Structure formats: structure tokens, C-alpha cells
Design a binder for these strands. Structure first.
Ligand SMILES: Nc1ccn([C@@H]2O[C@H](COP(=O)(O)OP(=O)(O)OP(=O)(O)O)[C@@H](O)[C@H]2O)c(=O)n1
Ligand SMILES: Nc1ccn([C@@H]2O[C@H](COP(=O)(O)OP(=O)(O)OP(=O)(O)O)[C@@H](O)[C@H]2O)c(=O)n1
Ligand SMILES: [Mg+2]
Ligand SMILES: [Mg+2]
Lengths: 437, 437
RNA sequence: GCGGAUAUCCGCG
RNA sequence: GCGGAUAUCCGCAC
RNA sequence: CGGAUCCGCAC
RNA sequence: CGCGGAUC
């Protein structure tokens, strides 16, 4: 073991190299030179300004302060104007309010506009509370900016860093707040092992209490959950990972897992041995950002799942993959084929009228009474899950999320069996089916 | 073809002919003759006495009237003595107190001991009511015996005459009580179309009312429901027939529906086109009466159905058949085969102690978290409905009804597909599957 | 965009 | 029984 | 009191 | 499971 030998070991893996530091430190100096000239207000916030970023996650967040007496467009316009005319490379994003994401001296940079604001109960735009976070954090974070790095690394290598919808994990700000609250990666990790789905972590009041859900109170605004977009499953994965760390520590907790990657042959035989219907719904990925695509991929996956559920194909698990040009909604069902015939249900024997209407209909098999009710044998539209999803996708594309549903209306495909294993989804399947090596 | 004429022609199918009527009359006289000289008290009751018996169903009922100071042991002993000593050939059967069945001059007779009783207030056995039933109906039935005969014939033709557990229909008594209420067959049929599962027919008060469920109030003991063992499905089945009749009457309603009987090859094709799984449990028939066997057959049929439903084989319908020596429980299932793997479900993530226990267990696949709970993949014991039941019948003969389960304990089989259609159940499978001719 | 809550319409029953 | 659709208020993505 | 089923009650 | 009631 030797936990602190492992902690020191992990430091060199998580702390950015001298070349990196100065690399961004040279892009920071130049970025100032170009703004100071254009004369508007700015502050550096985030993982760079507080000196908390990871080794290899060098991005610079620069908010622009704007007068209280403005309008949404006068922000959107003046901000996006500055970005492109202050960075070498540039593009666009559509979050809360559209912002610039550029590259200066080879270093990625975000540029968000927001309101100046006196004290943070005005909450005019929600991104208005970001410089306040910096204010509250700097100096309170001093001497601990390595314990923050250690945590972010611990997460990043277990896919639960980032509060983006691609992840639903811990935001960088939440990592900083935890280290303030507990005072050390390790004190955070130990205590986490007893975190519950109803744990409230009031940083400003230095107390843990019971609540409605897992709430971390923002010390800048008390009615804001810093951990709001952390999924229940990911909190569950973190709590367990801490337990498993403490109980038997290792350095491997800080190294990302390399994918499974096995023969299209072995995978074929696992499905053969599980006896399940495993299939994917392929289509062209829409041209939108991650914060937009992923929540949709999730809805699409849920809606089809609930279909498989409803039509009694008894699905096991679902998964998705976004790739270069394609997307893949992946499913595993316990029922490969279902009987053509099924039960309809009619009116109670009493209801004289609906009964003559129910028995009027033309059918291959004579109806019958059961527990004072008419029932009838009818034929299903489709007989396998694949045939079912193929029908559902065509008729219910609109309900599978806006941008994704429209990309299905244009083109979609059901791929199953040995054909499936030829697509770039092998790791996402083994993950899903819970394959060990 | 004009209602009123059809009833006329139906009478011929329903009324005992010249020969049969005085076949029993000569038997009635020798029975009086043999009883009188034993100086014992008796009344003739039932179908014969009130002269409502159906064609080909000639049976004398004689209740012996013992003074109410005897003992459930004396009238029991004396009753058999007189019963044995008055019939040509005799059997003994047990229902209330054991009584004597047999023959007099080629006519089937029942000789039942019962207490005389002055009032229908102190009723200490079901058989004690019969004298009073007759005393109430006699004379109130005169002028209407053919109308009762019609009603019994209508029911008998559609397999819902008899209150015995084998049928769960309308008793002979109930039919008479209906004709006394509605005055005629037809006025019964007309008005029956508006019976509900809550209808209450108090004959003594000559009022129809709304209660808790279908309840025909015994005029002799108004706490008794004369319609007690009429099923809901046979109440419905009748209520529907009357409607179907009135609307378009025919003699056809009074003749029995001769069984389908189709090629063991066309039936093979149906199960194919339905894509269901059809099988039977076959076992040696226990040696007990029908009112013991059928209730159990129902229970056994239910428990195995419930199993298949619980186990996710999606059962469609069930039926049973009781031949001379063997019994057959029949099932149709929507799932011919389910996957080997299923999901198990463990503790919520927070439960340290129980997660450890749950995650140590040896498995072929990595368990996973979902909605804050550990779930794990596992292997099913059986994978087809046939295998499933074999497992279930072996382990759970206990539950499938006392006498029946004991025979299933002894020996049972599962016959399915090509092998099944060779058995004597062809007629019950079709009805269950609702196959038209 | 996604999720929740409130209000309202369409469909298979 | 559900399966969709539409508006307003809320919350999240930085 | 020979019997089996079904519903209510306390578990 | 066990008891009570109803049912044929
Ligand atoms: N889900 C989020 C993301 C961001 N922020 C605010 O925006 C700042 C910068 O955002 P971001 O780049 O996403 O996080 P960083 O703190 O910069 O950490 P990192 O860059 O390593 O992700 C945060 O410090 C915080 O004040 C927030 O409150 N909630
Ligand atoms: N559910 C029943 C069945 C029968 N009985 C009584 O038992 C008598 C005779 O029984 P049974 O021979 O079985 O029927 P029958 O009424 O004589 O006519 P059938 O045999 O044609 O049905 C009837 O008069 C009736 O009073 C009764 O009280 N309740
Ligand atoms: Mg940052
Ligand atoms: Mg009789």
C-alpha cells in the first residue's frame, strides 16, 4: 500500500509539466494584450485563473463584464464580436447564451459575455454567478490547488469528471468546493464513502445534513445545486469507487482504462450463450454540439426502450455511441421472437352496444368471455424486436428528440448479429452486456 | 323464422315422449307400493314430482321424512335401511349424509333421508330445504311445466345447465324459480338481456333489485343464493345468448353444438400460424367425484398459468380435459423460448454491507449500477415454457390441489407439438384457441 | 436543446 | 388504459 | 362430522 | 400457514 507514496506518485501524472504551464502562461499574456487594447472589461475565471486545471486539460475561461442596463442581443452581439476579433482561430456554441470558443497561440479558449452585477441575488442570466465563484474561491483555495488536481484526475480517469451532458459528472467548480469543504483529496474520498442520495453539503455553513436529493449548496447562491447535473448513477459510481480505493488503494485508480477490444468471433458466442436479441439503430449524426446531441441520444434511447418494454420484448439494457458520421442506439432483449397472435380485450358482457361493435369486426379466431369480459385473438404487426423498432422508428421519429428524430426521418437502419460486430461499437456492447476479460 | 313458432317446434326436442313418461310412471307406482308397506313417511320431489324433468333425463327423487328428534346418525342409519330395501339394484353415495342411489323397474332413483321440520327457520342441512322447495313450487308451477322445460333445454343445449362444479351453471330449481318469476320462457329470455353482475331477484317479494353480485333469493330461506354456483362467465354467456336469440331466433339454439373435430395436420398448421407454444401436462386421473376433481383441475390450471405468467412466458389461455383414465391441463404461451440471461437486482449503492455480499457471488458477467442500485446478470434454470412447467410440477405438486397434486407427485408428462395432437384433446384445444369451422 | 411542473388539444380505446 | 402533440412557468449545460 | 374448492380473519 | 364462512 503506502497511500501517500501513491498520492505523490499520482501527482506527477496529474500536475501539468513546466512546458505546459508556461505554454498557457504565454497565451494568457498575449490574450490580455489584445483585450486591454479593445478597451472592455474582463476577468479570468476557472481552472486556469485559480491554477487548478489538469495535466492535459489546458483551457482558459475569460468572462466579459457588461453594464446592468443592457439587453440580451446587446450582449450576444458585442460579445461574439470581441471573441473573433481577439483570437487567431474561432467558432461558435449555443449554450445559455451563445459564446466564442477559440484558440490563441495553440491553446483552447472560451469567451463568455455576462452582466457586471452588484451582489448575486440578481441572477439575471445564471452565468452571472461565475465571476462570484472565482471571488469566493481564490485564496480560500490557495495551498490546496494540488488536492483539487488530485481529485479531478481521480475522476477524469473514471469518466465522471465534467458536468457536461456527455458525462453528468462532477464540475471543476464542484471539485474545488469539495476540497474547500473537506480540506484534502482523501478527506473528501474517505467521507464520500458515506454519501447518500439525500446528502446535502452546505459549504458556507460547514455542515452536512439530510435533504430531498444529493444537493451541494453553492456558497454564492444558496438556492443553487452545484451538483445539480451529476447523475444518481455517477454519484453511485463515485461513492463506490472511494470505498474500493480506501479498502485497497492503488495507482491504477488514476489511469484511464484501455477498452476491451475483442474478436467479432468471441462476441458472437457470448450473445449465442446469453440467447438475447442484440441490435443497433444506426443513423447519421446531426451537426450539433455535445450539450445538444447527448441529452437527445438519451431520450431516443429511452423512448425506444419503453417501446420494447411495452410490446413485451423485455429489454435488458440500452447504450449509445456517437462516432465520426454515425450514431448507434444499442439494445439487448430477452425475447427474440414473439407469437403472431395476442389478446385484445373488449367491453364487459353488460355493455350491449360496444359488444356488437367489438364482435362485428372481422377476425380469424372467435372471441370469448373471461371474468365477465369479451376478449379476442388478433395478429401483431411485427414478430421480432428488430421489426418492432423498425416500425416504431418510422412512425415515431418526431418523439426521439428534435435533431436526432429528424436525422432518423431521413435515414435509419436496424443492424443485428454478425453484421453488428463489424461496426465501431464493440466496447460499448461489452460494457453494456457486462463483459469481463 | 317468427319467434312463437320456433318455441312450438323446440317443445318436441324438450318434452318426454309417451313411452318414457309411463316408463317412469310404472316405476313411480311400484316405488310408492314398496314404501307404503314400510309405513314410513316420504315425499317425491324434484324434476319428476313437479313434472318438469327434461327428455331423456328421467329420475325419481324420494325424500324420507324422519322425525326431528332423531340424530345425524339415526336418520342416517334408518335412511339407508329403507333405501337399500326399496330399490332393485343399489349404490351408496356420499354428499350430505350418505344416501341410496339405484333403480326401480328400470328407472334411476334417489332415496334421501332428511328431517321433517315444521319451519324453514331451523335448517341443519342443505338436504332439509328440498321438501320446502317442492312445497313452495308445486301448484305455483302448474300450467307452466313446458316453459320450465324450454328453459332447461335452452341452457342444456349451450352447456350451462347444471349447478354442479363440472358446469357451474343454472340448477333445475333455479329454472323453475325463474319461470315462476317471469311467468314464462321468453319473458325470462327477454328480460334476461338486461341482467347485470349485480342483479338480485327476490322471487318472494317479486322485485328485481341491485346488490353486491348476481344473487337469486331463495323464497324458502332468503339468506340463500339459489344462483350461488353459477359462474360469472356463464351468467355472461347466457345474457349474451338471449340477446343473440331475441334478435334472430332459430331452433338451432336448442340443439347441442356438435364438436369441431379436425385433421391432426390442419391443427398443426394453426399452431404454426399462431406461432405460439402449445403443450399439456398429462397425469393419471385421481379416483374421486367430479365436484372434487374439477375444482382442483381449475386450481391446478390456475397455479401453472400464474407460474408461466410470473416467469414471463406470457400465457394466452388455459383449458383442461378429463378422460376415463388420464387428465390434461392445456396451455398456450406467447413465448416459445426466452433468453438464458436475466437481471437480478441487488442492494442500493449505499448499503456497504449488502453490496459486498452481493458482489462476491460468483458470476459470468460484471454486475452494474442503474438508478442507484446494483443489478447483476444471471442464468435461468429453464428457457422454454415446457421445461419451465416440468420444473414447476416436480417441485410444486403441493399447491396444484390435494388429490390432483398427489397424482402429479406420482407421475406427470409434458406433451407438445406433433405428439400432442395425437392425444384426445383436439376438441378442447380448438375451443380454447377459438378456431372457427 | 434536454428534464421537471402546470394548462390544453389529437389518437387507440 | 396508454400513445403521441402544443403553450406558460421552472431547472440544467458555462 | 366422508371430501374438495373458493372468500374473509390473524399472521 | 392455519381458522371461520360460503359452494356442489
Ligand atoms: N457546470 C458548471 C460549469 C461551470 N461553472 C462556472 O464556470 C467556471 C468555469 O467553467 P468550466 O470551464 O466548465 O470549469 P473550470 O472551473 O474552468 O474547470 P475545468 O476547466 O478544468 O473544467 C467555473 O469555475 C464555475 O464558476 C459552473 O458553475 N457550473
Ligand atoms: N343447486 C341445487 C340443486 C338441487 N336442489 C334441490 O334438489 C332437488 C332435486 O335435485 P336433482 O335431482 O339433482 O335436480 P332436479 O331438480 O330433480 O332436476 P334435474 O335432475 O333434471 O336437474 C331439487 O328439487 C332442488 O330443490 C337445490 O336445492 N339446489
Ligand atoms: Mg475551464
Ligand atoms: Mg331429477
Amino acid at each position: 500500500m503506502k497511500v501517500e507514496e501513491i498520492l505523490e506518485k499520482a501527482l506527477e501524472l496529474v500536475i501539468p509539466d513546466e512546458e505546459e504551464v508556461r505554454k498557457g502562461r504565454e497565451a494568457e499574456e498575449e490574450l490580455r494584450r489584445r483585450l486591454d487594447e479593445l478597451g472592455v472589461e474582463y476577468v479570468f475565471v476557472g481552472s486556469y485563473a485559480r491554477n487548478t486545471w489538469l495535466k492535459g486539460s489546458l483551457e482558459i475561461d475569460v468572462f466579459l463584464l457588461f453594464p446592468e442596463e443592457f439587453s440580451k442581443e446587446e450582449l450576444r452581439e458585442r460579445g461574439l464580436e470581441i471573441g473573433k476579433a481577439v483570437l487567431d482561430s474561432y467558432e461558435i456554441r449555443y449554450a445559455e447564451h451563445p459564446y466564442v470558443h477559440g484558440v490563441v497561440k495553440g491553446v483552447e479558449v472560451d469567451v463568455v459575455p455576462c452582466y457586471k452585477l452588484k451582489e448575486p441575488k440578481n441572477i439575471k442570466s445564471a452565468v452571472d454567478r461565475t465571476p462570484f465563484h472565482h471571488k469566493w474561491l481564490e485564496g480560500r483555495i490557495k495551498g490546496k490547488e494540488n488536492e483539487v488536481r488530485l481529485l479531478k484526475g481521480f475522476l477524469k480517469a473514471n469518466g465522471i469528471y465534467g458536468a457536461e451532458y456527455k458525462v453528468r459528472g462532477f464540475s471543476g467548480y464542484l471539485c474545488e468546493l469539495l476540497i474547500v469543504f473537506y480540506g484534502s483529496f482523501l478527506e473528501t474520498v474517505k467521507n464520500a464513502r458515506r454519501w447518500t442520495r439525500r446528502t446535502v453539503i452546505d459549504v458556507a455553513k460547514g455542515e452536512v445534513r439530510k435533504g430531498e436529493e444529493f444537493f451541494v449548496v453553492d456558497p454564492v447562491d444558496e438556492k443553487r445545486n452545484v451538483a445539480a447535473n451529476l447523475s444518481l448513477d455517477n454519484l453511485a459510481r463515485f461513492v463506490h469507487l472511494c470505498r474500493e480505493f480506501m479498502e485497497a488503494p492503488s495507482l491504477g485508480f488514476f489511469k484511464p482504462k484501455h477498452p476491451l477490444e475483442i474478436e467479432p468471433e468471441r462476441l458472437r458466442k457470448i450473445v449465442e450463450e446469453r440467447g438475447t436479441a442484440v441490435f443497433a439503430v444506426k443513423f447519421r449524426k446531426p451537426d450539433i454540439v455535445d450539450d445538444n446531441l447527448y441529452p437527445q441520444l438519451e431520450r431516443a434511447s429511452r423512448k425506444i426502450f419503453e417501446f420494447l418494454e411495452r410490446e413485451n420484448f423485455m429489454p435488458l439494457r440500452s447504450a449509445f455511441k456517437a462516432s465520426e458520421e454515425f450514431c448507434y442506439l444499442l439494445f439487448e432483449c430477452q425475447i427474440k421472437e414473439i407469437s403472431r397472435v395476442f389478446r385484445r380485450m373488449g367491453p364487459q358482457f353488460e355493455d350491449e352496444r360496444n359488444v356488437k361493435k367489438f364482435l362485428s369486426r372481422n377476425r380469424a379466431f372467435r372471441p370469448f368471455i373471461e371474468n365477465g369480459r369479451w376478449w379476442a385473438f388478433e395478429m401483431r404487426k411485427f414478430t421480432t424486436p428488430e421489426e418492432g423498432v423498425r416500425s416504431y422508428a418510422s412512425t415515431h421519429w418526431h418523439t426521439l428528440g428534435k435533431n436526432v428524430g429528424e436525422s432518423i426521418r431521413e435515414y435509419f437502419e436496424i443492424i443485428s448479429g454478425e453484421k453488428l460486430f463489424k461496426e465501431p461499437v464493440t466496447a460499448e456492447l461489452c460494457e453494456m452486456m457486462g463483459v469481463k476479460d
